[PDB]
């Protein structure tokens, strides 16, 4: 059981991944929650680098995929083998949307890179928490965080295109209140 | 002018890259010397990680390539544009040999990853400092450094296969004394430069 949450900052995907983690834990599943980039000692070092430094888009992609590769080999593949439920805050779709549709890198290439980092490991289901960029930015505004609307509009379109073309992707209206969004996710996970 | 030095540890490639750097500087070229992984603030952080941590071979490749990518965009492409001579201690061939022939990853994939990191930037000439593994290990022994002969034998074969199939590669007999190895390198370089 691999469950992947995907979408832009301000979509609530972090809060809802955490909500799903606590809820399935209470129902008696053995659960993991990891974020990308991050989730291992090494991926957290890369994460800090990805937030700290000024990086061109190729270097940044390679580091995202190095984090992913560590996480896959160190934790996910063994978690899966022990039948843990694995919940991910961001996965392969967010890399395509951000580094491909966002920043212009080749989508097929990103897909192949993703296949290499994951050893072909694919989610049972991917939850795309879709939200208009205007709303996402208003929510970030509240935590004094600012991001690029032009860039995020492209990223949004990317995500929606991927939802209609890639396999096992449910589009969740992430514009709702916390509890309505979560109910819609449970609906999708049944 | 991009000059790539390639080969196993103990081949003297680091010492000879440095030697070529001083000699061309003295002849009045503007020269850069970079190592892989490393050569930029970020690449050096990755380098430390690649030496420090226990890493599976996919993660390691992706970091080597991320260091490369930073170097190519931060320094090499602008150096080349200002007509600097760029000398590299290791480059794309060492990744194929080590991660492909060494550790079993797919060679065409490495190549494509290489092409991505380099933006298609290719050396004018690649110097392969070829040396028997027994000799390379005896030279490391002297600095208290030890490496895996089984693994390096595969890497060495890899390199030699690449030399006969890839473009603009000269095999240098790296088993010689320092000065003879250098004179053989100058001979190979009189090609271009």
From Swiss-Prot, chain A:
Keywords: ATP-binding, Kinase, Nucleotide biosynthesis, Nucleotide-binding, Transferase
PROSITE patterns (UniProt xref): THYMIDYLATE_KINASE
InterPro entries to which the protein is assigned, alphabetical: P-loop_NTPase, Thymidylate_kin-like_dom, Thymidylate_kin_CS, Thymidylate_kinase
Gene3D superfamilies in the record: P-loop containing nucleotide triphosphate hydrolases (3.40.50.300)
Top EC category: transferase
Reaction(s) the record says it catalyses: dTMP + ATP = dTDP + ADP
Binding site for ATP: 7-14
Protein name, as recorded: Thymidylate kinase
Species name: Aquifex aeolicus (strain VF5)
Gene: tmk
Swiss-Prot record, chain B:
Molecular function terms, GO-annotated: ATP binding; dTMP kinase activity
Record EC number: 2.7.4.9
UniProt: ATP binding residues: 7-14
Calcium found in the keyword field: no
Entry keyword annotation includes ATP-binding: yes
A Gene Ontology BP annotation from the UniProt entry: dUDP biosynthetic process
SUPFAM superfamilies, A to Z: P-loop containing nucleoside triphosphate hydrolases
Recorded catalytic activity of this chain's protein: dTMP + ATP = dTDP + ADP
PROSITE patterns: THYMIDYLATE_KINASE
Described function: Phosphorylation of dTMP to form dTDP in both de novo and salvage pathways of dTTP synthesis.
PANTHER family, A to Z: THYMIDYLATE KINASE (PTHR10344), UMP-CMP KINASE 2, MITOCHONDRIAL (PTHR10344:SF4)
HAMAP family linked to this entry: Thymidylate_kinase
Name of protein: Thymidylate kinase
Lineage summary: Bacteria, Pseudomonadati, Aquificota, Aquificia, Aquificales
Gene behind this protein: tmk
